[PDB]
Structure formats: C-alpha cells, structure tokens
Subunit: 236 residues, 3 copies
C-alpha cells in the first residue's frame, strides 16, 4: 500500500505508534489508544485650642510673677492667689488685723478690719492712754470733766480772765488793817490787833514786811495793840 | 494483516474507534475524528498633660477648701475667689466699709476703706460726740475753746494756782469794816454802816455770824451805825 | 476494504489526515502525528470633659463680668483677679493706703493698711493739728497740760466756782480805805492817803468814781489826806 494506490498493509507496533514517523503501516484502535497516551497522557490644635473669652480649651498655670503682672491668659491657683499680697502699688489679697499698727502674723499685706481698734468720727469712744494734739482743741458743747490737774498758759471764763493766787496780795496785802463787827474770826489770815505775836513760820510775809516793828522777835514778830475791834491781815 | 506481516484489513467501526482495544482493523480519517471526541471532546497623656509653670494643659477646679489651703495646682473660679474671704489668719478678698465698727452687708471679710470715717493723725477733724481719754491730754499749742463747763481736780495758769469762790471769804470776810471815799457803792456786797438792817435771806452769812448784835431781828439783822463813811461787808 | 469485510487499502494523505472525513483510506503513524497537530497543536468629649470639682479637663477664661458675678465654672486670670476691685457691695482685691482719706494711686479699691496713720484706742499718739469734739470730753486721769489759752463757759475746781477778774471789785472796790502797818506798799493798787493825786489814765475807775472830790483835776484827781497810816484802793 501507498498514499497513491491500494494494496497490502501491516499494523504498526506500539513503539511505531508512539514514535509516529513510520509511513508504511496502519493504525488499529488498540494503538490509537497507545499512541494517545504520549500526548493525551504526557497635638497642635490641642495646644492651640487655648482658653479664652468666647471658647474653652487649655491653660498654663501662672507663675507668681505673671499673676502679679496682670497676665490676661494664665491660670490663677490657690497658691498664686495667696501669693499676690496687696501692697500700696499693687491690688491684692489681705489678712485682716483688728489692732491698728500691727500686722497680722507678720504679714505686710494686712489691712484694718471693720472692727479694728480705731477711733472714728461718731463719738462715744475711749482712748486708753494719753493723747497729744498739736493745735487748738474745740469742744463744741458739753464741756469737759477732767480728773487731775489742768495747767494752762491762759484762762478765761466767758471772756473774763481767771484769777490766780499770786493776785490775792495785790487786792488785799498782808499788813492791811481794818475793823471787824463779829466776836470771832473765821480764818487765820486775819488776827485781832490786841498785841501778842505771830509765828514767822506760820506768817512769813508778815515777818518779812513788818518784822519787829510792833515788838516781839524775828521768829515771833509782834502784832499791833490797838485797844468793834481792829484786825490785821497776817497771812495769805 | 498483522503487526508482523502484510495482508488484508477492514476499517474499524465508530464503536471500535471509541472503544480502542480492537487490534484487527485500521483507522480511517473519519474515525480518527470520531475517536478523538471521547478524548479531545471529553486618654492618658490627655489627663497627664496637666497645667503647669512651663507648659499648658488641663486643670481641675479647686474646691473652696483647696483654694483656701493654697493648693498650687487647681484652678480658681469667680466663686472660689469670692468665697476665699480674708480673715485674721488667712489672706483673702474683702468688701470695703466706710463706717468703722460696721461690716459691709453682714460680711466678716470687711476692711476699712481709704475713706472710712476714722480719725487720723493729721488734724482738722471732728468727732461728733463725746470722747474719753484715760490719761493726760497734752495740747502742744493753740489752747482750747470749750463750750460748756470745765470741772477739774486742780488748775494752774503759768504755774499759779487758780482761785475759787470759797476763798473770797478768807481774803475779806463778811463782817469786815472799812472806810469809803465815794458817794455811792458799786455792789451790794458792802453797805454803809448807817444803822438799818439787812435781810437774813439776802445776807445769810452776815445773819449767822453777826445776828442781832447791832439790833434788828433774826430775819432782819441790824447794821452798825458809825456816824468819809464806814462800810461793812455783808455778803459774798 | 470496508467497515464490513477485508480487502485492499491505501494510506491517507496529510490533507486527508487533517480534514478527517475521508472513510476510504488508513492512518499511518506519520499521519497520526500530522493530524494531531490540528488538535493537540491548535472633639465632643474633649470640650464636654470640662474642669470640675472631682475631675480635670478644659476651661473657659472668665470675662471680668463673669468673674465679678461669682461664676462657678470659668477661670480667673491675673488680669481679672486684678480687675475685680473690692467695693462696698462686692468682695475683691485692694491696694493698701497708709494715709487715711487718700486712695493709693487713684484706686477706689484702696483699704487702710495695718500701718495707716489712724488714731487708735490704745493711747500714746499725736494728732498733728486741731481737733473738734461735739460733746463732753472726759479725762479719766492725769489731767491736761495745755499750751495756749483756755476759754470756757464755766469752770469749777473740786466743785467750787473759779473766780474771774471782774469779781475783784466786788470784794474790795476801788475807793476803799483801810489802814496799813508797814512802811512801804507792795503794789500800786493801793496808795497812801497823804494827799497828792493819781493819774486818771493809770486809775480810770478811781477817776470815774471819785473825780475831784479830794481836789486835783480830772486828769489828776486828788487823794484824801488823812494825816500807822491810811491807804486807799486806787486801781485793780
Ligand atoms: Cl486772833
Ligand atoms: Cl530777834
Ligand atoms: Cl448801802
Ligand atoms: Cl428775832
Ligand atoms: Cl503811795
Ligand atoms: Cl478839770
């Protein structure tokens, strides 16, 4: 057999079926299935969102220095509120003192309490000690009740000069003689002119002014004897 | 035909082509294509980032108690600033009072204002009422102008004792007789010794001291008749 | 050859092997492998976590208005602490003043310092100027030492009336005559009754009361001549 004309043919072996180049034999069903098996089978807007008027946020604690400087941003604490003591130049917190002229527990930021021991303008109070006033005292009504001695440079009552003891002798001097209408004398400033003596120590002005003019001695100067009665002024 | 030698062959059927075990027939093109189709076709560093000096952050509101204790961490509010009232032991805020000795609206944390009604050391003021001083008053200049009566234990002007009315009789006692140079008397303390009487009620000391020595009666005691003129002192 | 019976066969061409419909030829190994190649080869709980008592958080800065209103939530700054000035109606911060009656640097929220120039109740102080008191002064001990003149409506020492100069003439009037025991006179209130004259300008009361009764002239009125000696009271 050939491609061209008919004739005899044998069957291919298994080896020929697999090695499919032999052109001189024919393929049986059994070697279609042999031959197939070589082919078929092979943190900024946190910290920048600050506290303000308008909006809430975050806040730095003021140092004392910042608190005292009136810093409009920082926070005031218990400690820096306490630490900002009032002074004469800076608004601040104070302790009260009820004793004028004393600080309260050594604190310079002490102010006088409502009930401090001051004298006020309404009256009815007591100063428990002395007082000095450097110019005129005017008492507008009700006078003065004074325990102890008043010393004054001058004195007038309703425009009339007050009399003092040194003036007594000018009005009626020791040594004056008058008469007397009664039986007894009410004071020893005067004595009867019935002779006898007075004591120079009892009557020092009589002794100096009159001496022994009427007898007696220097210690016991004599009185005039003028015997109504006469009387003589012997002492102040 | 065989594998070994040449000879006759028939063609396989379709069924034989598919069931490829028959070794005794040959495969045509038409049954290559039949047989193929059985094979080919089958929250900590929030809350721990706190407010401080140095750094901003977060803050607890102080209770009053913490504010008053000077807590250095918490925040002061309007309410706890207001609530921290000054006392004698603790720095704080105050109301002002212009009236010494009165709290302002019942507030114990009241301090005297700059213009409270106090007496100061500079002068020129008025106390509208009484004043008591428990020891010596010194007026250093300008004296005193006193409306009303001064009562004093003692009085001196420039070191001389002030005279009082009870001393008048010692100097010139009722009952004294002197002479007189003028035609009329300027006071009724003295009377002419021209007899007649005085009234005991007008002249009680004359009546007691002299009685009816010179005539008259107890109510109308007689004066001496000594007829310059004589005069007698009849009353203070 | 046929499907049914045996006989002669030729071999298929390559073209027949590929176009596998020819039923009248047989397939060689070489055209199994040709024919196969057409088949085988073809931001709320931030802002709502607020500051409180109990818990930390976030805070709004108080305006002054809120601070002053005692707002219990907002924050106090240096500026609003400073800005909350004490008044009589509102607790606040103060400046101190040591001068009563003056604000410190024009600040209405000025309180008297512990050492302000006030008079207190304990004594020992000085008012450097005048003082007016509108009712009675009581000095409880130690009297008064007064530089300058005291004018008073009335005066008593230990309940006895103080004597004034206008009373002198009532006790012993100008014009009185008495006797005298000494050789010389200690004052010119009295003169010897030895004739001669006094000066009307030296002795105006004698001149008015006595005139020229004893001789002389109106300018130089005569004294009595009564020639112990007589004396006459010529002036106060
Ligand atoms: Cl006698
Ligand atoms: Cl002698
Ligand atoms: Cl008469
Ligand atoms: Cl009688
Ligand atoms: Cl003479
Ligand atoms: Cl004449």
């Amino acid at each position: 057999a050939t491609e061209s004309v008919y004739g005899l043919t044998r069957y291919s072996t298994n080896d020929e079926a697999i090695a499919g180049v032999n052109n001189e034999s024919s393929i049986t069903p059994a070697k279609f299935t042999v031959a197939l098996n070589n082919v078929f089978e092979t943190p900024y807007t946190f910290m920048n969102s600050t506290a303000t008027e308008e909006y809430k946020g975050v806040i730095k604690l003021g140092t004392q220095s910042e608190v005292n400087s009136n810093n409009a941003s920082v926070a005031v604490t218990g400690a820096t509120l306490n630490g900002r003591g009032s002074t004469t130049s800076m608004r601040g917190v104070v302790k009260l003192t009820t004793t004028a002229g004393s600080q309260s527990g050594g604190d310079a930021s002490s102010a006088l309490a409502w009930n401090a021991d001051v004298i006020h303008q309404r009256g009815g109070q007591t100063i428990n000690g002395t007082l000095r006033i450097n110019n005129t005292l005017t008492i507008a009504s009700g006078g003065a009740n004074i325990t102890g001695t008043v010393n004054m440079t001058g004195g007038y009552i309703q425009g009339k000069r007050v009399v003092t003891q040194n003036e007594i002798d000018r009005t009626i001097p020791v040594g004056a003689i008058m008469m007397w209408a009664a039986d007894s004398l009410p004071s020893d400033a005067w004595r009867f002119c019935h002779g006898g003596t007075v004591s120079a120590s009892d009557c020092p002005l009589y002794a100096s002014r009159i001496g022994t003019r009427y007898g007696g001695s220097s210690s016991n100067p004599g009185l005039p004897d003028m015997r109504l009665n006469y009387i003589i002024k012997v002492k102040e």
